[PDB]
């Protein structure tokens with residue numbers, strides 16, 4: 001059955017509530033002071049983290065080599081606590097998965113777990129009228145309030161929730177190589 | 189940690205979505221065609237079960253010997269499927285519990301699980317301005333939409349969610365003796 005225990009360990013040590021001008025989003029902390037949030041949250045130069053105003057030291061809105069939205073934004077945050085390093089739980093490659101859990105951590109739902117079943121590497125989605133790539137799909141009627149929600153199977157953190165149509169839900173993939181310590185590069 | 193697996197087995201085989209004039213409620217099926225719902229749902233002589241209109245053959249709004257609301261209504265339903273018999277999972281006595289799960293099954297949330305932590309035998313509550321007895325309390329910010337939600341620990345089904353104040357949640361107890369095959373008695 002679904003890996004509830006794994007989902008809970010991730011939620012407990014690696015999520016915070018983030019709030020931007022667009023509202024609240026579950027936020028996954030990946031390592032150090034680096035976390036993720038859906039690009040459509042519109043992160044600015046400060047953000048609320050568990051209701052504490054926090055400087056956004058860096059925000060990278062990921063796009064692929066076709067210059068298409070991946071709907072993941074990586075943020076670096078000015079705060080004292082380091083996130084437990086969970087990069088070894090990120091998949092190396094695109095993939096399909098079984099029996100996934102979607103976990104939410106907001107003010108309305110400080111801790112909630114939803115078995116969404118099979119998750120398929122879906123690819124392209126015209127999300128909200130923005131072309132988007134590398135989407136995961138699950139047949140579950142996901143709702144507003146669930147964006148940023150963490151999609152896991154046992155031992156893997158596979159994506160964050162970004163969208164739905166009333167019958168399916170959509171997550172943006174997380175891949176290991178998004179977070180490897182890397183390259184000297186002017187990015188803004 | 190929380191008994192997610194037990195909660196899921198109960199949700200899968202023993203809950204349906206019920207809808208009355210008051211809206212939708214998770215509904216626990218106990219045995220045969222007998223289920224429960226919060227008294228404040230106002231069950232009439234028909235009710236929707238998974239969107240199918242269904243005759244309510246009997247509805248008993250439980251009160252204790254002080255003539256106080258217990259907020260449980262037992263209903264007998266005209267339908268073909270029997271519920272798996274889960275009476276052996278109901279506690280014999282009032283009690284406090286550890287590490288409980290609140291599980292919801294509505295149209296908005298067809299399957300969702302919330303660790304609510306410790307559950308205490310609270311007793312009296314002026315619920316919605318109606319004196320109510322035999323209440324369980326948990327420190328979790330439960331919401332509208334969660335009434336009827338099933339509160340479990342491993343191996344026990346302990347109550348159904350009925351109320352909250354924005355910081356705590358409240359369940360009405362379920363006891364084994366509510367459902368024992370019993371006594372010739374004019375009840376309406």
Ligand SMILES: *[C@@H](CC(=O)OCC)[C@H](C[C@@H]1CCNC1=O)NC(=O)[C@H](Cc1ccccc1)NC(=O)[C@@H](NC(=O)OC(C)(C)C)[C@@H](C)OC(C)(C)C
Nearest residue numbers: 022038040041126127128142143144145147162163164165
């Ligand atoms: C999370 C963010 C949120 O609630 O705030 C909006 C500012 C929601 C989650 C989904 C809404 C409906 N069910 C869900 O699971 N995401 C969104 O609203 C997406 C845009 C977004 C905004 C902020 C952050 C991240 C994403 N938009 C959608 O999901 C739209 N879906 C969609 O376009 O799907 C296809 C048509 C491409 C299949 C929704 C809002 O659009 C409708 C399907 C309702 C028309």
Ligand SMILES: *[C@@H](CC(=O)OCC)[C@H](C[C@@H]1CCNC1=O)NC(=O)[C@H](Cc1ccccc1)NC(=O)[C@@H](NC(=O)OC(C)(C)C)[C@@H](C)OC(C)(C)C
Nearest residue numbers: 210226228229314315316330331332333335350351352353
């Ligand atoms: C479930 C039913 C529902 O959503 O529909 C209303 C028709 C809700 C769940 C709780 C609401 C707020 N958070 C919850 O966890 N229950 C209720 O609304 C209770 C009445 C009810 C109606 C239908 C079926 C079953 C029950 N009422 C309450 O929970 C009230 N709580 C309350 O009175 O608590 C004390 C003051 C006694 C501590 C809420 C609505 O009242 C306020 C606290 C908002 C003033």
